[PDB]
Design an enzyme around this catalytic site. Structure first.
Site, mmCIF file in Angstrom:
data_model
loop_
_atom_site.group_PDB
_atom_site.id
_atom_site.type_symbol
_atom_site.label_atom_id
_atom_site.label_comp_id
_atom_site.label_asym_id
_atom_site.label_seq_id
_atom_site.Cartn_x
_atom_site.Cartn_y
_atom_site.Cartn_z
ATOM 1 N N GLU A 88 0.874 -1.068 -0.164
ATOM 2 C CA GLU A 88 -0.157 0.052 -0.103
ATOM 3 C C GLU A 88 0.719 1.274 0.036
ATOM 4 O O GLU A 88 0.687 2.155 1.100
ATOM 5 C CB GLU A 88 -1.141 -0.097 1.117
ATOM 6 C CG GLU A 88 -2.348 -0.786 0.843
ATOM 7 C CD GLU A 88 -3.143 -1.150 1.791
ATOM 8 O OE1 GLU A 88 -3.719 -0.119 2.370
ATOM 9 O OE2 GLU A 88 -3.290 -2.205 2.034
ATOM 10 N N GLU A 122 -4.227 -9.144 -1.396
ATOM 11 C CA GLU A 122 -4.858 -9.011 -0.042
ATOM 12 C C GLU A 122 -6.260 -8.758 -0.288
ATOM 13 O O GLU A 122 -6.823 -7.581 -1.200
ATOM 14 C CB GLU A 122 -4.099 -7.933 0.890
ATOM 15 C CG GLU A 122 -4.488 -8.039 2.365
ATOM 16 C CD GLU A 122 -4.017 -6.497 2.902
ATOM 17 O OE1 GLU A 122 -2.690 -6.422 3.126
ATOM 18 O OE2 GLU A 122 -4.893 -5.858 3.249
#
Ligand SMILES: *[C@@H]1O[C@H](CO)[C@@H](O)[C@H](O)[C@H]1NC(C)=O
Ligand SMILES: *[C@@H]1O[C@H](CO)[C@@H](O)[C@H](O)[C@H]1NC(C)=O
Ligand SMILES: *[C@@H]1O[C@H](CO)[C@@H](O)[C@H](O)[C@H]1NC(C)=O
Ligand SMILES: *[C@@H]1O[C@H](CO)[C@@H](O)[C@H](O)[C@H]1NC(C)=O
Lengths: 497, 497, 497, 497
Positions: free
Chosen positions: A235, A340
């Site tokens: 991220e 994810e």
């Protein structure tokens, strides 16, 4: 071999209850005899990957729904399925007694469970850790002389990965992802909040960060673990946000592009770990296709990028053609891989809703969408959490398909576990998605693939409350006449020759 | 020798900032001629154990409050002051660079620091551990052949203790307490939650547990460490509460009594560690007098008990007179010891507040009250914590006198550290609490003791906002005229001949 | 009578599920025939106040445990039982559909439910409110010209109280308590934090505040609601603590004493509402006997105080004799009344635990303990809460005997509901506690009272896992032969002539 | 006329403090000769809609970014700007003393404020209400005889709306959205949760729901208020999410389509309020173009729809081009309107942040994006909120441009508020958006519009930290040389003749 023990906690469905002496399992997998199909069924009323077999018939008449296999419309090949070995997941499963741990690892990794062949391993700490650490917390240690793995790696994570691989017959692929660099590499000098690497790509900060990837790989290799791939950063877009609450490291798409071409790519190439693949993005799919354009239209970064990793928070709703579709059309030769997913950011619903069939459907519907849009693999977040959905050092709790009750020495396999397993169990590495045409509009989610050996697999999800009669045409073999009950999920398997 | 470097974190006073090359410290102890006193002073406003001298004069100029030393009125002798070497504390200390580690350890254990002479050692894991674990996790090893110390003991705790005692001039007394037994000795087969040992005192389990203490004491002895004392269990009343989150092992008073009578006492006596004292309770003071009555009114358990260990955590529920006061009256020959002298914090407050003068004032107030109710020693909880109050594998609710910021190679000395040091630095082992009569009702907390050598030590805590004019009289020397500033703590010391 | 519909949520026992069309209820109450006893049973296994009847035998042999009634040893008369109509409670009940509401109100206030005759009313906002407000929020409004009730009172609280009194056959007594004054009467100018009334008892601040009690009374009176008692302040000790997170007003025992003597006493006396009683303290019993000494040994303040109101948080097991006992002894003519109790700190588990039998036993055990120490009444906290244990504007959630699920139009009646009912249903106003002597040591909690009409009532609680056979002896009539099963509660009722 | 009084709360910028006697305001609008521009400027540094003038020159002295007005590319005409008069906002306004109320109402509604010309008015309760309620809560009033407006409508909202329109120069357009129907029309008989209307479009329930809109409008007409438009349902997609916490009523696009087609459309058409416009969706932009495709490609539905209402929740999930852009293409004659143009607040931040400049920028950036994608109007969410983000009967989640402190008879105007006024003050109804061309890639957000009288307005937002030198050409008048400071928003205004 052993049936589910159902338990209700007041939600739409039941969990299966496991302990040190009893866990639901499967018999060794056999193929259905030619001219027959195998069916696995999980339902909200409480069926759990229950097996039947039926006839493949030669004719079909009727004005009902027909799904037709298009065996020569060949798409993406599958890498596989799994979830993450976080600090939290490690702490929980090892808090179980040793026979319970083994039942738990069998659930995920064995042929008598759901045949996971991916494990994602955080590079040091994240929100799902009980403290904040890196491998290099000595300030200004550019040589990485004080690089080391804490007990979290050497006592909890590594031992469990070894055990997981031992239990698996399938080759397992390890994926790694860092949340933060050491704080002395960062503009803001903290594990969180807004901040990127200091200086410019090319320089000592950028070069030390690249080298930390290699040291990570070296230190896992000392423990006889090798990685299939690494991501460029978990991220990256999170560390671009002021007050970001947990471990992060900001990159703009341009900074990621330049880090990879200037530092990370050459550094991995020059190492003994050059066969480890590199995945860009590792973030929300809404950031596509722009991120991929910035990175991949620069041949200096492209040479080093094996694939694009995508995240998704399932409590939201982003369309898939706009992102996965266009990305694939722009870069058909760079794999798309979901690294994810999670649910439970749901604000009126708690973090863990034990027995929630809705969260089960969220999972399988997301897997199908991903397989329908070129995605080659699918990885869950935490492998196990507690009834609160942690530990989490910043109290950012979420659901997990397995929930550990340490005081009871029991774990609970939620509908998420079974909805995952309808894919992971029956879609081995190398499986190739192939076409499947519906004969009329419907409310069903469906996907077909062929195994490496040439056999068919179809998953069908029914997110509606009505039962749906349907037939599946495979021109090589005939028709399978079936019903998709409301709130069910089926996997259909058959030999084609 | 070196002053406090102050830093504010927006709480009511400051911390003292220490790092690899600097920490605040003391000159060797040097006390003046008869007729002169030494004062050490800490204030919310920022003074930290600052030293001054003054006269003790023939005449009295004060017209307010008078404290008169009464040396002929003699109370309990003092064992000492310390804190716990938990896995958490050890991990935090060892995340500093060697020279920083040495300044932190000198801060506590040296005469240039605050003179700690007690260390509490957990036996295997507690909540302040990054992992659950015991020294005998292999099931059914009733002979404990498989007993051993993990890395937490042999790598972290043991060398830190060896280094604590090298640094210390005063003999250091080690104290051990278990949180949980191996789970195969337990009813609930879990490390936490509601559960006790299996079966009955005298049985096969109760005996293996007793032998476990011997195995623990032996293992530490191979590493050249000897214990002063052990507790029979940490907080035994906790593991009777259903799903208690932390490592616990439930005993009723009656069960503790019989385990001591039948198993623990007899086993420790038959061992080479027969000199190791046994302490009962190790729990909230609210459980006294009762716990003591149950265990000590039985000659076969009482013969084996040296002391009663108490926790401060829940002091506000049951007052000193009724618990400590009453216990002493009934069992005047069994010492009282605060074994986990630690805080709260508050449901609406953070675990760690950097520079909180209140949390300090709570420490000294509580040590004074203790001293005034016959308590002979005080062991704080964790020696150090991180700024989140960790690591704790369940949840951190407590602050600590030293907070480590590993990323900065820096540690912070809280007001609690100096509040503790006003007692620990100047009340050596064998000091006796003597009388101290106030002339009129007042707001100070004050206590007087006499050193083994006969010299006087007095602590005056002003937990109020208002300066209080004070005289201290010694019948043998004269009058010490002073002021107790609002929000201050003072230690006075003087020769008496 | 409609029986309980049982539901599990994974805890130790079940809840009873009610909706718009169905709620478990009782038949109209009947006296058992002379020579026979009535039993009501509730068990962890799932019995909910089940009625059975048996014979009163003429003689008894054994050996077994014998509880003997002492009809002529008379203690306190009972005021009653009930709970709090908070903003949270009321918002929840009115979120149900009209018919569901009535079944919920019947449960509590009807003879066909559990017979509540106390309702505690907050004077404006508390933590179980979704906003902060007082009735006089215009700054410096000393004449109280903009004193008015909001919709929280006029639309939610008042109409629900009307409907509760309507349903009740017994007279219901209303009890009002304030959390905070207007902020312009306070020293810190906020609804929360550390701060008291400005100025000194006797002055304009203290007078305006006393007049606000009368204005409250006047406004409830216009809505045809009359009060039995007011507390001097909810948890006066709370307003003394810096950072106290919700609505509070700090009084030391001395300020409370003088506020009462100078202001609140004379003002209520001079009003048309002089018949309304005044209760002091309204805080934890750890504050006793000291608060009572301070207030009640002053005859200017004593003349105005009808009773001492006490709180207990049940997660903090602390006795008992030292507070309630010593207090009764010093002030035998000033009733003790329990004005608030709640469970759900257990930081190891939630605010709400649907079906927790443990929390049920904490309630009944606390009621017996109270009743065995002169306490004349027992009031629960929130009547109803949501599954999260709110709403609460400061997220300070706790459990409640009834839980509302608004999206289902269903309410769950927890074991706490029935454990309370074993008292409130069967002990009307005027009942007198009498003696009850156990023949031998035992693990049971028990309490005997006599109804205003001469009939007996005995409650027996079994908090152990073992069944206990036992006989109850009444000289008037004979023997009741019975068993107390483990984890059960029984009320026994017989005529004595 | 009166400047901003600034106050800081530790966020990136300041609020403007207003009380009963003082608020910032503007002078009556006054615009200069051809060749002169007016500029209003707000900066994070502290400037708030500060006015200055300057020349429009013949020669071009800048060499950086140039923006050229293209009055000849003409786009959408603007309906207006406003916010929602929720129960909560009405609460919050009315807790202020009348003079303070009026300064708040001039802030939004007069020319001495920011000239709001739209109010959104919820039909009965939403989350920002202190109770749940509809206008027909008595079951089986299928003809709606017991339909009435409560006190929230007649006491709070309606008088406030009246007062808003007295104060406003411009005609104000009222917009109404329902959140929930009476619960006895809902599948689930609950005010929230998963549930739609009962039965099928055409039936008794759908006919009653539709007549509810006419009774709602009827009732508001007796109060002399008439509406511009209604939305078909507020947020219909949320009533499909299981256990949705807020008031809701589920519609799939096909269901909305049919309800508009069969009931809502025909019923409104047959009534006296047939000139009231009907907007569809009223929900997140991610639901587009699809939602629009379902309803508008059905001529029975589309003949009845005037616009598409969107929410900014939830904007991050989907980009402007793909949703708003693509919807305009497909249905170029159905207007896009932002109906709930509001936050939302990052999972780890407070609901209300006093002085958040970043939240301000989020607003203006988003109004700009909307304008660049054919959007004709805006309604912000709550007009005012308390400093907690309430009252909200479920959860305080969002900020509001004005924050009200009832304890101090004072209100705070947030950066969001001035960011809104940079548009609403200078874009009167009927202003048409025009071309504004950038000469090079740049970082400013800019939009140009033409007033109905043919004069020019340009808004320039600078979300970066660096000053950008800027020229604006108007072909007809010349060159305006300027600087956009870092973290600033400018409005430019000029005559073109
Ligand atoms: C766990 O396994 C099965 C669950 O069906 C059960 O028969 C057994 O009693 C359980 N064992 C323990 C240790 O609780
Ligand atoms: C350690 O502290 C001393 C005293 O404040 C200071 O002079 C020095 O800079 C510190 N070390 C570092 C690396 O900041
Ligand atoms: C209410 O509960 C009763 C009894 O369990 C059940 O039969 C009925 O269908 C329920 N009604 C609703 C509306 O859920
Ligand atoms: C209202 O604001 C003005 C300007 O800030 C100030 O002078 C005045 O004191 C305020 N009124 C009150 C009651 O504080």
């Amino acid at each position: 071999a052993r049936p589910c023990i159902p338990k209700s906690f007041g939600y739409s469905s039941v969990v299966c209850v496991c302990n040190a002496t009893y866990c639901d399992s499967f018999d060794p997998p056999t193929f259905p005899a030619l001219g027959t199909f195998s069916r696995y069924e999980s339902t909200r009323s409480g069926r759990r990957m229950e097996l039947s077999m039926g006839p493949i018939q030669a004719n079909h008449t009727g004005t009902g729904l027909l799904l037709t296999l298009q065996p020569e419309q060949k798409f993406q090949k599958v890498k596989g399925f799994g979830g993450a070995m976080t600090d939290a997941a490690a702490l929980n499963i090892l808090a179980l007694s040793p026979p319970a741990q083994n039942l738990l690892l069998k659930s995920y990794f064995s042929e008598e469970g759901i045949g996971y062949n991916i494990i994602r391993v955080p590079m040091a700490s994240c929100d799902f850790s009980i403290r904040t650490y890196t491998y290099a917390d000595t300030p200004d240690d550019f040589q990485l002389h004080n690089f080391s793995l804490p007990e979290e790696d050497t006592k909890l994570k590594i031992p469990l990965i070894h055990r997981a691989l031992q239990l698996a017959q399938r080759p397992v692929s390890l994926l790694a992802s860092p949340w933060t660099s050491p704080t002395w590499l960062k503009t803001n000098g903290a594990v969180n909040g807004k901040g990127s690497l200091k200086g410019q790509p090319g320089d000592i900060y950028h070069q030390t960060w690249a080298r930390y990837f290699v040291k990570f790989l070296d230190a896992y290799a000392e423990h006889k673990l090798q990685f299939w791939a690494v991501t460029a950063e978990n991220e990256p877009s999170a560390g671009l946000l002021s007050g970001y609450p947990f471990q992060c490291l900001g990159f703009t798409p341009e900074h990621q592009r330049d880090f990879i071409a200037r530092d990370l790519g050459p550094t991995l190439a020059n190492s003994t770990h050059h066969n480890v693949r590199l995945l860009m993005l590792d973030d929300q799919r809404l950031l596509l296709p722009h991120w991929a354009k910035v990175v991949l239209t620069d041949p200096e970064a492209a040479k080093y990028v094996h694939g694009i990793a995508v995240h998704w928070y399932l409590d939201f709703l982003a369309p898939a053609k706009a992102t996965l579709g266009e990305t694939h059309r722009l870069f058909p030769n760079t794999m798309l891989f979901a690294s994810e997913a999670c649910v439970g950011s749901k604000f009126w619903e708690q973090s863990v809703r034990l027995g929630s069939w809705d969260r089960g459907m969220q999972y399988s519907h997301s897997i199908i969408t991903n397989l329908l849009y070129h995605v080659v693999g699918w990885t869950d977040w935490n492998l196990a959490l507690n009834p609160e959905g942690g530990p989490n050092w910043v109290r950012n709790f979420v659901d997990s398909p397995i929930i550990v009750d340490i005081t009871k020495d029991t774990f609970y396999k939620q509908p998420m576990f079974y909805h995952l397993g309808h894919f992971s169990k029956f879609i081995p590495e190398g499986s190739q998605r192939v076409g499947l045409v519906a004969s009329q509009k419907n409310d069903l989610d469906a996907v077909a693939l062929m195994h490496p050996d040439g056999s068919a697999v179809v998953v069908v999800l029914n997110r509606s409350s009505k039962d749906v009669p349907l037939t599946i045409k495979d021109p090589a073999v005939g028709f399978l006449e079936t019903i998709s009950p409301g709130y069910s999920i089926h996997t259909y398997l058959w030999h084609r020759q």
